[PDB]
Ligand binder design. Structure first.
Ligand code: A1H0Q
Ligand code: CA
Ligand code: CL
Length: 134
């Protein structure tokens, strides 16, 4: 199974680590432009994959998670809630809402809540295909 050039294959999906920095809303749009989605994490193994991808490039990166709803709870850009077994991935002391932080990112060894208006790297996810989707 194939991924586009400069996407990474992991367990049937393709992952794009951005070369540029954009705000969270612009990162949502950027992933949609390439038939993809600002990354929604579905399994522990996927989180482990992504956390090490980001940790080693030492890059802070947007994921598809925000509390921009009425409840103020963390929900994925596909509308699914943050499951209890993922609360462990927040960094020590996070989320801390330090300056109106509604958008989740990879930060060091876990997750951070950041201001949505910050320019950050991002990761897109789409299914692997029989062809390279350029
Ligand atoms: N995309 C990037 N640069 N991510 C890293 C990052 C973290 N923060 C904040 C900062 O707050 C301190 C005042 Cl800037 O660091 C605290 C952790 O100590 C945070 O909880 C808080 O979200 N701002 N950028
Ligand atoms: Ca924070
Ligand atoms: Cl880019």
């Amino acid at each position: 199974r194939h991924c586009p050039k400069d996407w990474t294959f992991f367990q049937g999906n393709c992952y794009f680590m951005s070369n540029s920095q954009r705000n969270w809303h612009d990162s949502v749009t950027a992933c949609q432009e390439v038939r993809a989605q600002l990354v929604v994490i579905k399994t522990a193994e996927e989180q482990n994959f992504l956390q090490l991808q980001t940790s080693r490039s030492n890059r802070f990166s947007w994921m598809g998670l925000s509390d921009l709803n009425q409840e103020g709870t963390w929900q994925w850009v596909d509308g699914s809630p943050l499951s209890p077994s993922f609360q462990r991935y927040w960094n020590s002391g996070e989320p801390n809402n330090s300056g109106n932080e509604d958008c989740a990112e990879f930060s060091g060894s876990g997750w951070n809540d950041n201001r949505c208006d910050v320019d950050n790297y991002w990761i897109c996810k789409k299914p692997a295909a029989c062809f390279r989707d350029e």
